[PDB]
Amino acid sequence: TITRPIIELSNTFDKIAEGNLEAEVPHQNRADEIGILAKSIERLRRSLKVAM
Amino acid sequence: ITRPIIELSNTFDKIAEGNLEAEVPHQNRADEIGILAKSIERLRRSLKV
Amino acid sequence: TITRPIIELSNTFDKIAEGNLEAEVPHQNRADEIGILAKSIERLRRSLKVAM
Amino acid sequence: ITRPIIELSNTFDKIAEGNLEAEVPHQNRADEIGILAKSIERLRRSLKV
């Protein structure tokens, strides 16, 4: 929860959930749970953008 | 499917603000929203210890 | 153009372009140009469905 | 981005009805629509011989 990468991902997913599909998804280039979650947010962003 | 995406972004905000008991919705979907929900749930479990 | 798998993919992509995201994309399980095109139509279908 | 998807479905209908000269739109996009357009264009070329 408590670390900065987590809060930053939460901010990024709030922007995508409000329809801002251009903002860059941080913290992808890692293999732990933070990186798995970041890559999922990124794939969802790309799908929502192709649909718009 | 904005409703489930908004629900899951609100739940991740609760976990990121230190509520590690938050129930994570939509884990059973067989699409990217259910993969994201599963990953939020795995992160939540890992933080709890 | 002229073969049945091609016409069938064209029908399937017409349905997805009209918003019918449930119909099954045929001809994916092959490696030639027909199968590459079918798998692309399928990935687009899945993205449009997650966005809806 | 329904407009480009409708455009590319209409172009694929022209090729599937035997117009192998049809210009295929949207090949330069860097997303799934541009991958689909590229694959329609590759199929069109392959049919022409």
How many domains does chain B fold into? 1
CB count within 10 Å of CB C49 equals: 16
Cα A47 to Cα A16, B14, C1, C13, D35, distances in angstroms:
11, 25, 29, 17, 14
Question: Domain span at residue A51?
Answer: 1-52
User: Given CB atoms, is C44 within the 8 Å cutoff of chain D?
Assistant: yes
CB count within 10 Å of CB D46 equals: 12
Interface of B with C in 12-41 (CB under 8 A): 31-33
Inspect the structure and tell me whether chains D and B have 3 or more CB pairs less than 8 Å apart.
Answer: no
How far is C-alpha B33 from the geometric centre of its chain's CA atoms?
9
**CATH number of the domain where residue D39 is located:** 1.10.8.500
Non-local (6+) Cβ contacts of B16 within 8 A are: A1, A6, A7, A9, A10
Q: What span, in angstroms and rounded, lies between the C-alpha atoms of B23 and B14?
A: 10
Collect contacts of C18-22 with beta carbons under 8 A, ≥24 apart: C21/C45, C21/C48, C21/C49, C21/C52
Torsion (CA) A35, A36, A41, A43 in degrees, nearest 10: 110
Structure-determination technique: X-ray
3-class DSSP assignment, residue A17 = helix
Closest CA to B22 of B32, B10, B30, B31: B10
**Beta carbons of B1 and C52 less than 8 Å apart:** yes
Q: What span, in angstroms and rounded, lies between the C-alpha atoms of A45 and B48?
A: 28
